[PDB]
Ligand binder design. Structure first.
Ligand SMILES: CCCCOc1ccc(-c2c(C)ncc(C(=O)O)c2C)cc1CNC(=O)c1ccc(C(F)(F)F)cc1F
Ligand SMILES: CCCCOc1ccc(-c2c(C)ncc(C(=O)O)c2C)cc1CNC(=O)c1ccc(C(F)(F)F)cc1F
Ligand SMILES: CCCCCCCO[C@@H]1O[C@H](CO)[C@@H](O)[C@H](O)[C@H]1O
Ligand SMILES: CCCCCCCO[C@@H]1O[C@H](CO)[C@@H](O)[C@H](O)[C@H]1O
Lengths: 257, 256
């Protein structure tokens, strides 16, 4: 009992230590209590690229696509240090850690993306900018069809009203997953995953005591997250096939191979 | 600062390797004597006072995989202690270790070996080379070539300060297949080799042609592991009864 309480406290500390944007910091900005420069067209995007403190320019949709890859690459840096900060994770052999991150970071990215989003847009560049969803909708396909489902997911996910102490356990349960293809020491990860999910439902009882059925709802979001990454990797197969102009970051080439 | 770079790696070496060449040379010269293992009985005694048992040759082969698995644990933390290495994305770290740990292992074996055998079990035992030769093929064909290299490598008379820079150059190799950030690695390797060459002329001022000799040993090690990888693959096909540690199954999966 007092082990899961200590486990939750340590994972939450890793979370706050390594991630650049909490859901608390983002709700502060999106409610005007922390103003981000609104990016809604080519005009404000060019000003942002000159004014905001953040490859050959091919076009507008491809430029935004490169900005998205930067976010992913940077978040993967943080997601590594978050998982490395978990002793059970660092105990695994280093190649099993890569297997977990390879199949794990994108599920965790789309969950954390809900933490910096309302139904009208998202926060970019350390919270100093707000890119409207309608401007993202107006990009040309496939780049439009890639971004839009992440909003539709982030809206339904934000209905559960999790805070950062909830997400730290939730994201940790995402990475420490025994279902990953090619895992060397499978039952070891399954044991770690069970400890975190137990720690999650225990923390959900204390922090969200009146919320009924919250834990089985979160498990469903973990299933919805596997589908979202499945469909995402399918659209990435299309970008590498039809978009000969767009280059792909080497870290994303390794993930989608 | 190259002077600080070499000193940091030498610190990570002492910080992560229980058995240094300095410690091992004390035990092999006489300044507690190791328990000599030369037959089945002394091996049996050592298992008490120092996987399903198939036979003796496979049992020793199982205890060799234990040393490799443990030495890979130490090498991982040694590489992680090099801050330039930790900045690499985790997948690139694995690639360097995957194709590098065994070149590093076969070089570090020479630190605990004389012409008559090697130290085992944290230095509390000495396994003879004739007892390793007495094992049946292919287990005898896998171990003896390591002795040949280990004795020729000991002729360079390196100490731990040299080996620390030598091991770091093996791990941080730009030629590893599947490397993501190739230029970054090639830069780090170039820094270590500069630090090694600079450290060699200061520590071995009279050693003629020492640095280009060590570069030949690095190529020699790449040949030894390639030959060692093939022998392991034939074992995985011929010997159904002998099981491989999953960490070695991942390493030898693609080595040709
Ligand atoms: C609920 C939120 C949905 C939107 O968020 C999404 C959705 C999908 C992706 C994505 C894409 C498109 N392609 C490949 C991958 C992959 O990693 O496989 C990923 C993860 C990225 C973001 C994150 N976006 C950004 O951070 C961002 C940054 C700057 C700008 C700016 F316009 F100002 F320049 C625009 C931006 F949108
Ligand atoms: C110059 C030194 C040469 C000998 O050292 C060698 C050579 C090859 C290997 C090896 C093998 C056989 N197979 C696969 C791999 C692989 O990793 O691919 C490796 C690296 C291991 C050792 C290290 N030996 C031991 O540590 C050891 C431990 C206990 C016992 C005991 F008998 F007491 F139980 C005997 C031992 F020899
Ligand atoms: C900790 C020591 C590091 C050595 C581990 C050996 C590396 O294994 C490799 O892990 C990769 C995914 O992680 C796989 O894609 C490769 O097929 C496999 O060869
Ligand atoms: C920091 C997160 C790292 C995640 C990057 C994704 C990992 O890439 C994979 O790395 C393996 C060896 O390194 C290769 O065998 C695989 O073919 C490759 O796809």
């Amino acid at each position: 009992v007092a082990d899961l309480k200590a486990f939750s406290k340590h994972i939450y500390n890793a979370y706050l230590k390594n991630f650049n944007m909490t859901k608390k910091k983002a709700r502060s900005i999106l409610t005007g209590k922390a103003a981000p420069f609104v990016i809604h067209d080519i005009e404000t995007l060019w000003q942002a690229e000159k004014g905001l403190v953040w490859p050959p320019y091919k076009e507008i949709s491809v430029h935004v696509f490169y900005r998205c890859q930067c976010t992913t690459v940077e978040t993967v840096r943080e997601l590594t240090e978050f998982a490395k900060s978990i002793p059970s994770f660092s105990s695994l052999f280093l190649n099993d850690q890569v297997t977990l991150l390879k199949y794990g970071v994108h599920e965790a990215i789309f969950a954390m993306l809900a933490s910096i989003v309302n139904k009208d847009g998202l926060l970019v560049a350390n919270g100093s900018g707000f890119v409207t969803r309608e401007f993202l909708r107006s990009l040309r396909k496939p780049f439009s069809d890639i971004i839009e489902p992440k909003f539709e997911f982030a809206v339904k996910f934000n209905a559960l009203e999790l805070d950062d102490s909830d997400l730290a356990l939730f994201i940790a349960a995402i990475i420490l997953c025994g279902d990953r293809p090619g895992l060397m020491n499978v039952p070891r990860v399954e044991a770690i995953q069970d400890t975190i999910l137990r720690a999650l439902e225990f923390h959900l009882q204390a922090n969200h005591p009146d919320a009924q059925y919250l834990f089985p709802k979160l498990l469903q979001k973990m299933a919805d997250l596997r589908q979202l990454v499945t469909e995402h990797a399918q659209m990435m197969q299309r970008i590498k096939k039809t978009e000969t102009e767009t280059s792909l970051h080497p870290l994303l080439q390794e993930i989608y191979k």
